[PDB]
RNA sequence: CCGAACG
């Protein structure tokens, strides 16, 4: 119940605070054991996804924890790729929190781009959640940086195989329901 | 979102500018003339509406003995003064566009065009005004130039304005709010084409209509050396700054940044930085100020409450432009202090620990005052020297408010949603709403209440007001945010939230989640109850506990007999409660500084001077009940040494009698239960009586000592086990300390936290014993028993638990029993009154009213004296004669008599909801006469039985003096003449009543229910014919 | 210590007058 | 109270000179003002506001709107002076009969030229 | 007229009596004849049209 | 509530006398139907000494029309021009406005609250009193 | 007519910490109490003036002998207890807070025995 | 930071 009791102090945490620097430096203070860090990085999630919308408190905390020790910003990947193998479950609200936090993240280098490789994109792979919570999370990066600054960095050969099931190439069925999926996006 | 969305707005390539001026008509209202009003009112609607509109401005205007006609202005406080304003102000807005640049902003008649767009981008950008509004007197334009029409324009300016010595930037106005990087320059084409388009502007209108003026204005110009377009709209300080322009560096963080995106690119082209205008800040102070310059004695709850209106309205309105305004952060911790020492000042303690966080912050179910919290956050703020030149991010905080612990209570924004956010989520919900019955309408599958939850609190009108009691009749309802915008010149209250309503805006926030968040943070209820007297109330459960109001007993009494002799004397009670429940917390012996009484006759010590906590406590531990408690448990406990008074090698122990100041005696102690017993047994070394082990060595006879005394622990120290092994630790070891045996064992009883404890040598077959004594003790006795009532009528908590039945009329037949059942009715003194059923006597005691030569209360002492007289017969009376059940009339005397039946544990005392006419026995002539007759108190034995219950039963003569009783409380001096039927018709004198055969009898009490039904109902506008059994015997006894 | 950041006086703003450092600075 | 006398004073003396000094809008700013509206309002295929009518199909909707503004003065108020318990009486009269509440307003509109003192 | 600490009556008038422009035509005459040429060419060109 | 009858006229010009123009408060007490507000409006509407119910004379009308039209609607501005009082000025106006043109939806409903009672003459004392009068 | 002014309750509530500071010593010396005990009662009294006396009431600037007592015992206790010493009754070590009493007095005199010649 | 009197 200690984790319960770090849950506490974690939450408690995020909802007495102002600014993402209170937060954090508060939450830094309260002395995170390495190993449980990620107990705090899901409640980071898990409260900014329960907000009615986006307060870039969450974003904001973490692309200022995630250069502050890189850690974190592999727990933060990780966990991404461990919720885009549930996001099935996630209620609308939430769905766009985390989505929007991971895009505007994305778009400001605060990860890696290597996180994208979950995205696959097939039909038979694709629920309704997957590509709902992908076009929220290509229009807002689309938004953070642009249409041509993601033109741009979305095709660079180092950027290539990351893109692999997003972009597929093995099937033209894959080619068309991608290409009309990410049309109706914007 | 607009600026954003001008074609090319951010573009200084071919040196266009960007110029935003904002300015009042100065005014605007003051200058209405009526005869040009009416001409042009009559353009609009009907000459009459006109005529009458122009009419009702025209009125003298009074306030006290001042008077004067107004013939010029307008009215502001008339209710369609708004729709004059619009109005008038339309007309202004067309003197500035002129009919072409506003039929092109407004769009065709037939398809006008939404509030900042065009059809076209060749209407759009025909001319420099791109974008215009005005909030009713207060004009936002934003202008395009060509270098070629700013260069126009300034030199038009200066030519008009000449200045060689270049005076031209020394008064001009731009806020030194924002950063001195950010602001617009000092450049001479920038600060020459905000003059220059706002005199421009000026020159397009009437100075007998209205001017601009430079300093009620604000131009702020975005050209190539400038990268901000800046403007203040409502009470926001807004700052875009573009992409392509000075970011350099692409910025999307912050919380209450906006990103501002092109309705076509859909690239976020632009960030709109929000603080608080120093208007904005000054205004929730002021209010602050006001809500703190009140009635001066007001309930701390109200203080509270207003503090969060006034709280719950800033931040609610600015949500996201509090976050980075840092003077509103240091405001808001300065202003929730403030309130807060308000409150603290109320007690005449401004201490911290006596009112830590948990009173301020606990919600009013919790017996807290419920104030909401801005103030607990870190206050980021840079080093100083640099950190207006180039916005260089915060390196160090300052520490907000004051905890307890490393506590931290909810910050109130993270629960207030971002305006951002809304607006996206509105967009989101109101579009696919749109959709979805554009879709289904025609499919005949309409859209109804749970196709949305995904959306209910979504859209800024929330997706929760189609589902509305009124929808019909409120979309009949328009101008309705300005009539609330406008409702400021009419009545004197300042609403809040004059910028939304209900019906028509939802809700838009929700603070329940920050309540469960806060109780959450406080330790969760029951770490916030620790603090209360709750523990002390003995409810077993905070669950089933509902606070009162009172608000039951405000209206319900009295329209206008409370007076100001008695104003606050009510506006106390509510602080009372208040501070008695928070006692634990407030007189707590950590305190900085207090000299530290101790109560009168009690053992509470009071460290400082809180007087509504000294008056509780006074008056819960009245009748000497320190005494009494202490009398009671070592008393029970010798008892229970009669209980068990042969199992183990012991005596009788009676009760030990000692001096009465013993309890509070909080040094030294002495003399608990005696120690008698015949033989020896083996005592333990001084361990805890938590623990069971350890029986041992050497034991002396006749020896055997047990000390229980008791205790008001404190929130801070309530610990009764260390506070009996250090009492037992020290005076044992100390001198002063009168223990026969060496093995004096400490016995404590914690009577605000209902804890009991005890160390020392335990001789063996005790802790098993004294543990079970103890265990039952805390439950059982009277006197802690009146201690937990006493308390709860302090703090007026209830269970759903309320005691046995009352005397209603289901028990009518459980008095006439073979056990001795009593009534009392204490109003009549003064004389006590004394009613028998079951024996027809009367213990009619008459009390003289030297008993109140110089009594500090009639009826506080009466009352008291009533139940020490009923004390001091049963006192005075045989043990044979004492009674088992006392039914009390009056309410009142619950208190008293439960005391002072402590010594005869065995009578019980309840309630009574029947009501009987003992007032009319003072309406007898005997008791009418003798009794003010009498010179000295004494005993009259009576008996209303005068010759009656010798043949007739004890329930049938007692339905005969019920119609007797109401036709004396009612009928007196007609029930006379039933009793007084003829002189030959005699009495007896040593009774009170005639007394006649069974015929005549019946026919006078037939006579006497008569009197009572026939004038019952011509009261009651009820026929006497259908009176049932009960209806008739329910109203001829007492009261249903 | 006070490297020019903040109240000079902590008495009539209502803070007990800390200023902690950010444990999140870069 | 020393400020309200002083722009009273002020406020006095405005509305004096006015009456001195004359209207301050000038005979053609007016003319070009009420010109300028006429042509705008014109362009807008405006269509006046009619006196409301008697068979008026909102004409009630609206009076319960008004009176719901009027009495929600009077849902935290807990002492009323004179004229405010006269306005609460007056209220519930017109929420008690519309038509006749409605019949007075159309009169009041159509004939009165004339108010009462307005206290400030 | 503030004052009576008397309460003396003074006559209703010795109460009282002891301490007791041409642009507005031009105005509404130019607003007048506004309204009569504003109403005769919307009418004119209004049946017309 | 209702309109003055003349007993409390008479009293409230014996108050004016006794107490002053700025009272009305304190002349409000006599009178239990009328209100500070309601005396006050009646003084300045119609017993103001200084009110001339004369008859209209006829520089006097022509006064009247003039200003009706140069601030029109404005009575209480018209009202000391021509030196009677806004409700005798509006009244004049109308009279004179239907002698030029030689039920009606423009007069009082029986149960209708009359704006200003003020400004109507007293209904006289009558042959019986009450203990209210 | 017996509400007595801050001469009256500064000089009493003065004597009541000379009594309680003569009685400590009478306490040792009768034998009720050791030298130990003395010494901690004695740095007792005079780090709790403001629990034992009440006297700030009638001066309230002695608000800063108070917090200087305060301050001078949290630093007194801290290097006191250092090792297996520990957290009670024990310390004392009073003439530091001694002397911040002593200089109250020093400087308290001659403003008392002007209030109280003007009472007398 | 922190408490007393009076009104
Ligand atoms: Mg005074
Ligand atoms: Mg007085």
Redesign the interface.
């Known amino acids: 119940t200690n984790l319960v009791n770090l849950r506490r102090t974690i939450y408690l945490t995020l909802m007495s605070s102002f600014d993402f620097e209170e937060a954090g430096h508060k939450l830094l203070k309260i002395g995170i054991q390495p190993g449980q860090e990620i107990e705090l990085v899901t409640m980071i999630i898990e409260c900014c996804s329960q907000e009615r919308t986006f307060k870039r408190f969450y974003g904001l905390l973490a692309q200022r924890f995630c250069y502050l020790n890189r850690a974190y910003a592999e727990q933060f990947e990780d966990c991404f790729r461990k919720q885009y193998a549930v996001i099935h479950r996630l209620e609308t609200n939430k769905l766009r929190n985390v989505s929007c936090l991971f895009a505007h993240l994305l778009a400001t280098d605060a990860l890696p781009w290597s996180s994208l490789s979950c995205i696959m994109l097939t039909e038979e792979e694709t629920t309704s959640s997957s590509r709902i919570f992908i076009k929220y999370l290509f229009q807002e990066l689309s938004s953070t940086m642009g249409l041509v600054k993601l033109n741009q960095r979305l095709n660079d050969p180092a950027f290539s195989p990351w893109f692999e099931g997003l972009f597929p190439r093995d099937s033209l069925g894959n080619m068309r329901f991608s290409i009309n999926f990410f049309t109706s996006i914007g | 979102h607009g600026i954003n969305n001008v074609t090319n707005v951010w573009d200084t390539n071919a040196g266009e500018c960007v110029v935003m001026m904002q300015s009042e008509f100065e005014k605007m209202y003051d200058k209405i003339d009526l005869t040009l009003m009416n001409r042009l009112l009559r353009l609009i609607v009907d000459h009459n509406i006109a005529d009458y509109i122009t009419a009702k401005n025209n009125v003298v205007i009074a306030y006290k003995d001042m008077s004067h006609t107004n013939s010029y202005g307008l009215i502001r406080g008339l209710q369609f003064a708004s729709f004059i304003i619009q109005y008038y102000g339309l007309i202004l807005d067309l003197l500035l566009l002129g009919l072409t640049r506003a039929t092109e902003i407004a769009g065709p008649p037939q398809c006008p065009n939404e509030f900042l767009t065009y059809r076209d981008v060749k209407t759009e950008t025909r001319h420099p005004i791109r974008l215009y509004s005005r909030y009713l007197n207060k004009v936002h334009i934003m202008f395009r130039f060509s270098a070629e029409e700013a260069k126009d324009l300034i030199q038009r300016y200066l030519t008009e304005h000449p200045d060689p010595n270049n005076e031209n930037i020394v008064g001009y106005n731009n806020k030194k709010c924002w950063p001195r990087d950010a602001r617009m320059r000092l450049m001479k084409h920038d600060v020459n084409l905000g003059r220059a388009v706002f005199w421009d502007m000026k020159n397009r209108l009437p100075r007998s209509l209205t001017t601009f003026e430079w300093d009620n204005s604000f131009v702020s110009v975005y050209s190539r050396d400038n990268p901000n377009l800046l403007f203040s709209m409502l009470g926001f300080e807004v700052r875009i700054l573009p992409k392509i322009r000075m970011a350099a560096e692409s910025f999307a963080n912050k919380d209450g940044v906006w990103a501002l995106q092109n309705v076509h690119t859909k690239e976020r082209t632009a960030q709109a930085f929000l603080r608080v205008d120093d208007e904005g800040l000054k205004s929730f102070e002021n209010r602050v100020r006001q809500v703190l310059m009140s009635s001066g004695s007001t309930t701390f709850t109200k203080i509270a409450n207003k503090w969060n209106t006034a709280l719950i309205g800033l931040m609610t309105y600015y949500r996201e432009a509090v976050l980075h305004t840092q003077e509103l952060l240091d405001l808001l911790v300065k202003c929730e202090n403030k309130i807060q020492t308000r409150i603290k000042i109320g007690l005449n303690s401004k201490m911290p620990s006596r009112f830590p966080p948990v009173v301020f912050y606990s919600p009013k179910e919790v017996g807290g005052l419920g104030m909401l919290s801005m103030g607990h956050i870190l206050i980021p703020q840079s080093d100083l020297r640099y950190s207006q030149q180039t916005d260089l991010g915060v390196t160090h905080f300052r520490a907000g408010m004051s905890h307890e612990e490393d506590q931290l209570i909810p910050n109130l924004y993270r629960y207030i949603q971002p305006w951002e956010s809304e607006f996206m989520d509105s967009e989101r919900v109101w579009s696919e709403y749109a959709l979805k019955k554009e879709e289904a309408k025609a499919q005949n599958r309409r859209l109804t209440l749970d196709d949305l939850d995904d959306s209910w609190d979504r859209g800024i009108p929330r997706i929760n007001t189609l589902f509305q009691k009124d929808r019909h009749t409120l979309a009949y309802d328009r101008g309705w945010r300005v009539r609330q915008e406008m409702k400021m010149f009419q009545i004197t209250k300042m609403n809040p939230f004059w910028w939304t309503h209900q019906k028509h805006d939802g809700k838009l926030w929700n603070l329940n989640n920050y309540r469960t968040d806060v109780i959450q943070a406080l330790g969760g209820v029951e770490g916030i109850l620790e603090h209360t007297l709750f523990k002390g109330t003995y409810f077993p459960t905070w669950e089933g506990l509902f606070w009162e109001k009172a608000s039951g007993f405000e209206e319900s009494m009295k329209y206008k007999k409370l007076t100001n002799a008695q104003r606050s004397g009510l506006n106390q009670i509510p602080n009372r409660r208040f501070t008695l429940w928070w006692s634990p917390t407030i007189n707590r012996a950590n305190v900085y500084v207090g000299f530290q009484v101790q109560l009168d006759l009690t053992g509470i010590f009071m460290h400082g001077k809180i007087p509504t906590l000294k008056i509780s406590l006074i008056q819960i531990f009245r009748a000497h009940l320190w005494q009494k408690i202490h009398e009671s448990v070592v008393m029970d406990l010798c008892q229970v040494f009669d209980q068990e008074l042969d199992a183990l090698e012991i005596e009788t122990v009676q009760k030990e009698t000692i001096h009465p100041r013993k309890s509070y005696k909080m040094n030294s102690s002495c003399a608990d239960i005696l120690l008698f017993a015949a033989y020896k047994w083996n005592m333990s070394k001084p361990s805890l009586m938590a623990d069971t082990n350890d029986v041992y060595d050497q034991k002396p006879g006749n020896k055997y000592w047990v000390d229980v005394q008791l205790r008001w622990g404190d929130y801070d120290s309530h610990d009764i086990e260390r506070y009996t092994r250090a009492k037992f630790l020290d005076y044992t070891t100390d001198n002063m300390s009168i223990y026969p045996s060496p093995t004096g064992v400490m016995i404590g009883i914690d009577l605000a936290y209902n804890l009991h404890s005890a160390y020392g040598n335990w001789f063996p077959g005790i802790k098993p014993l004294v543990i079970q004594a103890m265990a039952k003790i805390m439950k059982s006795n009277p006197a802690l028993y009146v201690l937990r009532e006493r308390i709860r009528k302090g703090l007026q908590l209830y269970s759903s638990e309320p005691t046995e039945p009352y005397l209603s009329s289901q028990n009518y037949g459980e008095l006439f029993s073979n056990q001795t059942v009593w009534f009392v009715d204490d109003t009549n003194v003064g004389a006590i009154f004394i009613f028998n059923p079951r024996t027809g006597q009367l213990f009619l005691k008459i009390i003289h009213t030297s008993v109140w030569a110089g009594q500090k209360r009639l009826s506080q002492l009466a009352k008291w004296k009533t139940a020490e007289e009923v004390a001091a017969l049963v006192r005075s009376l045989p043990v044979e004669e004492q009674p088992k059940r006392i039914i009390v009339t009056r309410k009142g005397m619950l208190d008293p008599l439960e005391v002072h039946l402590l010594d005869f544990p065995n009578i019980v005392i309840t309630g009574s909801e029947l009501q009987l006419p003992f007032q009319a026995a003072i309406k007898l002539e005997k008791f009418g006469d003798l009794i003010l007759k009498a010179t000295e108190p004494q005993m009259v034995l009576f008996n209303i039985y005068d010759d009656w219950l010798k043949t007739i039963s004890s329930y049938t003569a007692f339905s005969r003096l019920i119609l007797i009783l109401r036709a004396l409380h009612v009928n007196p001096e007609k029930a006379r003449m039933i009793l007084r039927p003829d002189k030959s018709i005699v009495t007896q004198p040593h009774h009170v009543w005639p007394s006649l055969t069974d015929e005549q009898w019946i026919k006078v009490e037939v006579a006497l229910k008569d009197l009572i039904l026939a004038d019952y109902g011509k009261k009651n506008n009820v026929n006497t014919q259908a009176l049932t059994q009960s209806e008739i015997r329910d109203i001829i006894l007492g009261a249903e | 210590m006070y490297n020019g950041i903040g109240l000079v006086t902590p008495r009539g703003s209502g803070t007990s007058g800390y200023v902690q450092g950010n444990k999140f600075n870069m | 109270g020393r400020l309200t006398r002083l722009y009273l004073k002020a406020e006095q003396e405005r509305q004096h000179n006015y009456l001195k000094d004359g209207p301050y809008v000038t005979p053609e700013e007016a003319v070009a003002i009420y010109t300028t509206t006429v042509h705008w309002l014109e362009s807008r295929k405006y269509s006046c506001i009619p006196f409301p009518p008697l068979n008026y199909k909102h004409d009630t909707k609206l009076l319960i709107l008004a009176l719901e503004r009027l009495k929600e003065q009077y849902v935290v108020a807990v002492r009323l002076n004179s004229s405010q318990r006269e306005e609460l009486g007056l209220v519930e009269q017109a929420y008690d009969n519309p038509h006749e509440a409605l019949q007075r307003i159309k009169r009041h509109l159509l004939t009165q030229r004339s108010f009462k003192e307005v206290a400030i | 007229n503030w004052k009576n600490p008397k309460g003396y009556t003074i006559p209703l008038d010795k109460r009282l009596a002891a301490d007791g422009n041409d642009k507005f035509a031009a105005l509404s005459e130019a607003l007048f004849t506004a309204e009569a040429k504003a109403r005769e060419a919307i009418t004119m060109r209004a049946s017309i049209q | 509530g209702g309109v003055w009858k003349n007993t409390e006229d008479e009293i409230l010009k014996a108050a004016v006398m006794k107490y002053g123009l700025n009272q009305w408060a304190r002349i409000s007490s006599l009178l239990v139907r009328k209100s500070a507000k309601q005396c006050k409006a009646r003084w300045y509407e119609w017993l103001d000494p200084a009110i001339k119910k004369t008859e209209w004379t006829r520089e006097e009308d022509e006064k009247l029309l003039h200003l009706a039209k140069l601030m029109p609607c404005q009575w209480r501005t018209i009202a000391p021009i021509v030196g009677r009082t806004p409700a005798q000025c509006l009244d004049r106006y109308e009279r004179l406005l239907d002698q030029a043109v030689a039920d009606d939806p423009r007069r009082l409903r029986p149960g209708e609250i009359d704006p200003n009672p003020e400004a109507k003459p007293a209904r006289p004392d009558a042959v019986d009193m009450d203990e209210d009068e | 007519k017996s509400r007595f002014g801050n001469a009256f309750h500064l000089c009493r509530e003065i004597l009541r910490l000379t009594k309680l500071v003569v009685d400590a010593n009478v306490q040792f010396r009768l034998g009720?109490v050791d030298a130990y005990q003395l010494a901690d009662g004695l740095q007792y009294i005079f780090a709790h003036v403001?629990?034992?006396?009440?006297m700030?009431?009638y001066k309230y600037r002695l608000?800063r002998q108070?917090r200087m007592c305060?301050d001078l015992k949290h630093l007194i206790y801290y290097r006191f207890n250092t090792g297996p010493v520990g957290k009670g009754p024990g310390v004392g070590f009073w003439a530091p807070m001694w002397r911040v009493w002593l200089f109250f007095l020093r400087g308290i005199v001659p403003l008392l025995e002007r209030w109280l010649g003007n009472l007398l």
């Open positions: 009720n403001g629990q034992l006396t009440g700030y009431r608000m108070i305060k």
